[PDB]
């Protein structure tokens, strides 16, 4: 379904990355954060949720959604609660030189993710939303 | 006691 | 014309909002960043590219893009170098008091922005993906 | 020297 993302957390160099999937699609959402605490991730998923049309979010159920920030977000945000990083992790590598920071890479590892092509994830997230939107 | 923190 | 974008700044309360405009749509990207230098401005950008079509960012040419960095990443990522944001600083004072932190509000105010309904209007966000897809096909 | 910085 169109509105169906995963999160999920990933671990590099000792930082915390989420990983938001649109599931029909394979595009992703990645930053890193500062800490996998409830109130970094509630402002992650704030984000996407203003961004795309976010209507299910799976997570992985730990530590950071116990507590009441996510579900704020989640509640205000009108967003349900209930491979990847390790394709995410090799584009990094692949790209990791070519920053210094940690971050850089990642967003690159995100644009090559989404942008690589006979559609690419990017192509598939968009042309999934709009044939949903009638 | 806000959305964010509190 | 589907890949162009517009980026300015503006400023609340002692801190520096990026503001991405698809142009063609309305449909805005922005966040709080901690001061408008190259690197956090080529930061936003190589974001923003990474989720959607990026061809073209209008910019306002000022100090943050005569450097290296803006430049940098957007010959990497493939890009060729308001009434906004007074709507969004609007929308960020009525949401404001919901959040103790200026980018949650920010994000909030995105939100509204993005997902309003004009009317069967379209919201912001679904105008960029029909005119993205529309163009994909 | 890198894409971010130096
Ligand atoms: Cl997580
Ligand atoms: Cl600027």
Not at chain 1, 2 to 15: N, V
Not at chain 1, 19 to 46: C, D, K, M, R, W
Not at chain 1, 83 to 92: A, Q, T, Y
Request: neutral net charge.
């Amino acid at each position: 379904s169109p509105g169906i993302w995963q999160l999920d957390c990933t671990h590099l160099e000792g930082k915390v990355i989420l990983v938001a999937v649109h599931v029909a699609s394979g595009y992703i959402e990645a930053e890193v954060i500062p800490a996998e605490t409830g109130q970094e991730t509630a402002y992650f998923l704030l984000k996407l949720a203003g961004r795309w049309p976010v209507k299910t979010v799976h997570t992985d159920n730990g530590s950071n959604f116990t507590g009441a920030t996510v579900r704020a977000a989640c509640d205000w945000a009108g967003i349900k609660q209930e491979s990847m990083n390790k394709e995410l992790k090799k584009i990094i590598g692949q790209v990791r030189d070519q920053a210094e920071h940690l971050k850089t890479a990642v967003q690159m590892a995100v644009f090559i993710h989404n942008h690589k092509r006979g559609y690419s994830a990017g192509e598939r997230i968009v042309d999934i939303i709009a044939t949903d939107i009638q | 006691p806000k959305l964010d923190n509190x």
